[PDB]
Amino acid sequence: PQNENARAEALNLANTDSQYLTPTSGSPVRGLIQDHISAGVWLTSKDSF
Amino acid sequence: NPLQGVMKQHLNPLVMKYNNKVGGVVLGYEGLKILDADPLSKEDTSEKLIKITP
Amino acid sequence: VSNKKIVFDDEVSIENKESHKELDLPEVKEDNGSEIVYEENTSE
Amino acid sequence: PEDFQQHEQIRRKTLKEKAIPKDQRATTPYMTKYERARILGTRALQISMNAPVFVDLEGETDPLRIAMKELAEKKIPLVIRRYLPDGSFEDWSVEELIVD
Amino acid sequence: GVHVSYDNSIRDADGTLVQFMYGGDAIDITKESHMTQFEFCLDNYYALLKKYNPSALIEHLDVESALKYSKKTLKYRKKHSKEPHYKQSVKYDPVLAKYNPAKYLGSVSENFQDKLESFLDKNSKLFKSSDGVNEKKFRALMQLKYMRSLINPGEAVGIIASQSVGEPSTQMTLNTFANVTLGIPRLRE
Amino acid sequence: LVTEGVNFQAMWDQEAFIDVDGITSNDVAAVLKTYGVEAARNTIVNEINNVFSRYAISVSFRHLDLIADMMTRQGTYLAFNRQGMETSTSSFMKMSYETTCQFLTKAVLDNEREQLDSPSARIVVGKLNNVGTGSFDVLAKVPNAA
Amino acid sequence: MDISKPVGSEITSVDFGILTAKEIRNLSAKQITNPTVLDNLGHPVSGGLYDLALGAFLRNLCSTCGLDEKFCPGHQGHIELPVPCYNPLFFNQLYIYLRASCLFCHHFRLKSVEVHRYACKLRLLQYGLIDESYKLDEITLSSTLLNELKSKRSEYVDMAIAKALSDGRTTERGSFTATVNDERKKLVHEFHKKLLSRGKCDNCGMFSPKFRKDGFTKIFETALNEKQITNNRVKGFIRQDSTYILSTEVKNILDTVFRKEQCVLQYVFHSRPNLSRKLVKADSFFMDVLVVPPTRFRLPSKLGEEVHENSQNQLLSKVLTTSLLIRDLNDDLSKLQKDKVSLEDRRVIFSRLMNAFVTIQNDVNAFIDSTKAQGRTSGKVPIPGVKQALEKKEGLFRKHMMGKRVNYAARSVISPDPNIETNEIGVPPVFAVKLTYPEPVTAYNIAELRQAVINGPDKWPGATQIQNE
Amino acid sequence: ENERNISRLWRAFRTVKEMVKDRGYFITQEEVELPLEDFKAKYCDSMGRPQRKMMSFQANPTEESISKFPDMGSLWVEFCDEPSVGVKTMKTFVIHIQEKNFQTGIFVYQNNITPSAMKLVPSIPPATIETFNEAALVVNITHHELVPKHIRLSSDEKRELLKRYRLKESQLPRIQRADPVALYLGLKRGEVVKIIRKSETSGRYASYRICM
Amino acid sequence: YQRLRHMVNDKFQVRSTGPVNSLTMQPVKGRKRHGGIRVGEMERDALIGHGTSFLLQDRLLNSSDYTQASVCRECGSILTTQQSVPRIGSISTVCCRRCSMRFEDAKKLIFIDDSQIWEDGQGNKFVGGNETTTVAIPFVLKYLDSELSAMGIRLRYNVEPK
């Protein structure tokens, strides 16, 4: 985008962080997957020091 | 400085040139007034609205 | 008319097609930085 | 010449008929997410072309960031004109709207 | 061009009024998740109070009018509770019909009003084993939450509804194995 | 109980076995004819919701209500096809949907004015959109104006 | 688009209408008359389709404004059609009114009283007065009664509009919503159905011969049937106080009908009140001239190295030849003395005239809507007319207005990266160096932009150019 | 075996009373809830067959109605005894309506109104006339779960609605003049109905439609 | 392990500006010739759905076929204006061919001011047609208007201020 009005809109209205919940049902669309889930189960285990 | 700006941008350049609309040479000008875009204000006040281009 | 038009269209079609056959097309750039392309076909 | 005067009087009259006076305002006292973005962009545009700035830059070079700063201190001299669907409108100053 | 207007109604671009209020309740779907998550809001009360900052709005909101009207209607709606829907009292329209949810604290959907009051009613326990949060204060905060979950004037709800039906329907391109018409064919019918 | 086929009046005679006040249908147009537009509206909402519920897809009734209110805006059962579209006040929007020269021919013969309110029309003429950030005007407060 | 070139004037609405041959002639930069486009040295033929009055072409300067191929916006010219043609876009509507006409009393064959009832309703709908248009139908208290009925309906419409204007409900510009537009469209449909549904004229009682068409815009007139010729001469005393039919005959018939039935037509052809006060004319359905669009919209193409003529020019030159040819038929036609002109020569002259009209009408059709043109030299495949240009594939509107190819963008295969933020995008330098942004220079950023300009086009973060004041 | 037929007539009668009450006229609650037996008692001969002519009745506006709708006239309901409706019977009915000065006539026919007689419907302004078939009154559609409560607005209520939303009449959502509920409430063009919906989202929710 | 051949013309592309198409003045299709990337109908709807009217304006106007063009405020056309051709020393002005009289015809019907006459390149003199300004339109609008006038159809743009 090529002018500050369009900048402001892309950073405040259509920006990724503005779109955590979907408008379909109002639920999350962004999260971590694969390695990151497996990693979490391990890092947050009681056995972890 | 809106009055200053209207003067330096538009009016001053008209001085001592022929102008097609008044059908003569413009010698000069008096009593410049901005029309407030807020139609509810008094012709008095020195705070006025000017609509900005999209 | 229609019968005369046949002959007249033929010789004009031939004439016009040959004229264009050795035409020379000159580049036109905008202030933008933009060549203007002579093509009649948005083939997208 | 006589009738341009008339034309102007009609324009100005209908404009006044459309304006909803301050104390009869009825829309949300909150700044909308749309109003915010445009206010920022537009004020940023004016900053980029040497509008007098009402806040300390403190090294900032992004005019959008300067606007944001101005917004934060409520020093943006802009007014939002909200249109109801019949074309009548309410003027709300940026400073008076609750921002979030 | 169907969008939310500054009067909370939903209009087409030519001014034609399509709905009088977005969900019958003016709520943004993407601000809705925690509106009836009361126990999550009661823990976390203090952070929510910081976030919503009631101090900055006292001068700009009517804090009495809608609450008073709300009680008037809760009475009539209960006094005529068990009688069938066509013999219903219509002396009193819902609060949202009369008071702008953005301006009047307490102007709130009746579902929400009920869900909230039921919670407060059935959970007096949590208002002692709380951090000093009393029943009154929590109602107010939840009411303020509703206010801050409103759809914004300007939203292209029409485009969004279209996408919320078209996009998810791509998951119905195939099928499993009454006897009725299903999936996309039906959606077309 | 569930019937293949629709005939409300016939069912109205079986008052002895069924609660006639709670009979519902698949068929939006049948309901419209017998019970009216509000009933038909509800039937549309439920039917569209039934479509998604079967595939465990969740879609807010807020969208569904709007779609159904739209469809019933003329007191009737209007589809999102040529006929429903044909009513729209915007000739530029119709021109950009289906059959440009037809809608254009219609506009000319009506000596129509495009008021430029639809998103389509404004894109055609290069006008800032009416929705969102285009739904209001911005004005500058300037001092020293007398 | 440049934030330092603001625009003060703003377009607020668009009005649809029809170009008159008078306007066109006045605005035209050149009348085009030569089918031939170039000469042996590749220069524009004067009076031809690349005539320099229509705009700069190749290395030549525009003869109208003097600007070159870059700053010259182009200018329109016109072709003079030697004989009126039906405008193919409107031929169906023309057909409706023609059929509906009474070729004797020159009203529509629908009874005047009914036609007036439609005029009343449509007029009310210009002001959005839907309830009133139904109330209009509620009005009743043989030719003496009818004029009082007409009169009292008329005074109702006036009273309703007056009342509607005094309170909020309308302006002199009308009121136009979807529900209004729906009621309007129904009425016009109902009106047209009723127009064509009449045989004998309800007003003078005569029968007019029936009109039949082509898909190629030709009109035939079927002469009168036996019972009907009998019926017609019985009414002979009261009035006392197949074949191709030329477009000129058709125009004369409609010209008169449009004068007589002007009242109703004034509302059938205007969805809003007609403040302009212009009459509704039959000419609107005909073309006496064709607008030749500016040269920049009709340029040749290069398919690699070979150069191909513009297809719209190929169609226009066919209009041009037929045009010259008819101007010759018209020349020999005047050199006939009627003292040698037979009764049999009457048939042959007509034969030649029908021929001319048909083929000019075909050449016009071919240029505007190739569908309505007779398939050429069985093969070749038709050359697109204007309709087909606007409607090619998804069509101009969808392919170049609702969606566009744009400047300042890039495309690439995507690759995963866990090391950027969830709200970032990792941009390859190959893009970063070619995509620019126009930053205005100020006190607060002069340091930064100095460095960018020093860095140049190829060292990031740099700059590719400077815009001066 | 006319036991059904009588029951169906008893049922259609109930709907008519309910309809007339809903329109604003004074009808007792006990009158609506007339038990099946009492109905035969009052309206059948000693023969078991039902006498339609005895069923016909007059209705006057109530207290609230007179205040809200000053020009609400009196209403007359007719149950034609004849399987088909002659133009003879129609006239007799219409005369009755005009002579004794009623604002509304409701004609409850059994199955056939000759289109000859349908002509006489708008014959006596300012008064208005409505027709209903019996078999379509066996059930009260407004009692249905899917049919929200429609309330007719007064001219004052309508003026206020249009002002509050700055609306032109035709920008409102439409309800067809011949919509089953419109016909039930006797809606004239231009009248606005307030509709109290149950929302899945909100509780009660007021919407409106204009009759065109 | 097997290495799979490329089946696809993968290669990336970027365009700031570059060649435009003659009729629409919109970016040509290309890659190998600096073509633009398409924002089509689906992306239009997305941009409306966000409420981002400036992003929409940036893509479908500003960064595509944005054009400052002359209109006649009087007849509402964008096709009948041209630059005047002035005598040497005088400055060129913007005039409407529809709204002005051929000089002869105007004489043939009070004195006529000097500022009211203009000339073209051929040499014909005109009286009037000086009510012009500039408006910002997508170029493709000019093409559409042009095609429509071929079909005998007139678009009339109402411009403000008058």
Ligand SMILES: [Zn+2]
């Ligand atoms: Zn030129």
Ligand SMILES: [Zn+2]
């Ligand atoms: Zn006649």
Ligand SMILES: [Zn+2]
């Ligand atoms: Zn002009």
